[PDB]
Structure formats: C-alpha cells, structure tokens
C-alpha cells in the first residue's frame, strides 16, 4: 500500500480510548519542535488538510530540561488556561533555544509579561488548581503511550506519525507528506 505501518506511521499496540482526534506533544527544549513551529508550521498545515471543526490538542512534556522542563509544562498549562498559546509559543522557543535567556521560572514569567499578560493574571493562573489539573492532563496523555520522543502526533489514540520515514530533502514536501498522512489516518 502507499501508506504502510512502519513507514509514514506506526500503530499503537495498546490503543488509547477517549483520546483527542489530533494530539501533539512537544517540548520547548526540543529542536525539531522548534522547526515544527517556526520553520514548518506543522500544526497549521495539518489543520488546513483536516475537516473544519476537528479538535486539535497540543501538550508539553516533562522529560526534557529537568526542573525547567517541568516549569515549562506548568507554563504551557497557564497558556492553555488563559488561551494565549499563540502569544507565547515563539518567544518561549526562542528564549530556550535561540537566545538562551530562559533559565528559571521567573524568566518564563517574563515572556508572558512581555506578551501582554498581566502579572496578577499569570501568578493567579500559575497557582490555580485548574492549571494543576491541566498539568495532570498533559502528563496523563503522554503517559498513556509511554512517550519518550518529541515532536509526536497521535491520531484517534491509535496511530502515531513517523516523520523519520518521510523525505527531508524539501521542507514543503515533508510538511505535505506529514499533513496528508494525518488526513489519511483521520479517515481510517
Ligand atoms: O528523527 C527523529 O528524531 C523524529 C523527527 C521529528 O521531526 C522530524 C523532522 C525531520 O525533518 C524536518 C526537515 C525537513 C526538511 C528539511 C529540513 C528539516 C526529521 C526527523 C524528525
């Protein structure tokens, strides 16, 4: 077949019931995730190839960066709770990987302050139990599939994208193959 298990995708030996339709995992310490955001725009290109209104979910992970990696998972929960993901994603990526100006939880808070989120707004969300639950939700979704690598995308809790088996000589062809595979899997 043109799409084959082990080539463009792999199949979960333990399917995950009730999972989101399109579930992405990333880390702000993850280099390919940086490319996926700034250079390839995987999330938007996948969204444009899927039916309108399909739920897409993106979660942060703990296993990169130690203490700060967990801080970034809590900060991502704040971003999701406040709905400011589009405002903080790029400065957080660049703060961690490009300028390396993010060395503490205070530095992460500075990114939100600079993006226009009020200090009282950030601190209240950061210490809220709604955000504690969002952190637990991110951990549980990752734990359901024993996630050891990012960037990762799962479709209907059953199929995992395999970008290693996709052509990397051309950035746009890669994105197109990636998005077309997600579409194929969503119609499975
Ligand atoms: O292999 C891995 O650990 C998994 C993996 C995740 O995202 C990737 C992106 C890759 O290429 C992107 C690209 C495409 C065209 C031109 C430059 C870069 C390759 C591998 C992965």
From Swiss-Prot:
Record-linked Gene3D superfamilies: Glutaredoxin (3.40.30.10)
Family matches, as InterPro entries: DSBA-like_thioredoxin_dom, DsbA/DsbL, Thiol_disulfide_DsbA, Thioredoxin-like_sf, Thioredoxin_CS, Thioredoxin_domain
Transmembrane annotation, as ranges: none
Sample GO molecular function, one term: protein disulfide isomerase activity
Protein name: Thiol:disulfide interchange protein DsbA
Disulfide bridge map: 30-33
Keywords: Disulfide bond, Periplasm, Redox-active center, Signal
Biological process, per Gene Ontology: cellular response to antibiotic
Compartment annotation: Periplasm
Phenotype of the disrupted gene, per the record: Induction of the PhoP/PhoQ two-component regulatory system, suppressed by 50 uM CuSO(4).
Cellular compartments per GO CC: outer membrane-bounded periplasmic space
CDD domains: DsbA_DsbA (cd03019)
Encoding gene (name): dsbA
């Amino acid at each position: 077949a043109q799409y084959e298990d082990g080539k463009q995708y792999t199949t979960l030996e333990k399917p995950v019931a009730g999972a989101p339709q399109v579930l992405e995992f990333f880390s702000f310490f993850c280099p390919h995730c940086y490319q996926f955001e700034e250079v390839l725009h995987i999330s938007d290109n996948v969204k444009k190839k899927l039916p309108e209104g399909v739920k897409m979910t993106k979660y942060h992970v703990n296993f990169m960066g130690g203490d700060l990696g967990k801080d970034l998972t809590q900060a991502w929960a704040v971003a999701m709770a406040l709905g400011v993901e589009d405002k903080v994603t790029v400065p957080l990526f660049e703060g961690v990987q490009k300028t390396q100006t993010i060395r503490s939880a205070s530095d992460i808070r500075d990114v939100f302050i600079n993006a226009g989120i009020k200090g009282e707004e950030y601190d209240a969300a950061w210490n809220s139990f709604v955000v504690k639950s969002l952190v637990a939700q991110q951990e549980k979704a990752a734990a359901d599939v024993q996630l050891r690598g990012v960037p990762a995308m799962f479709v209907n809790g059953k199929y995992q994208l395999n970008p290693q088996g996709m052509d990397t000589s051309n950035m746009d062809v890669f994105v197109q193959q990636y998005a077309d595979t997600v579409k194929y899997l969503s119609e499975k």
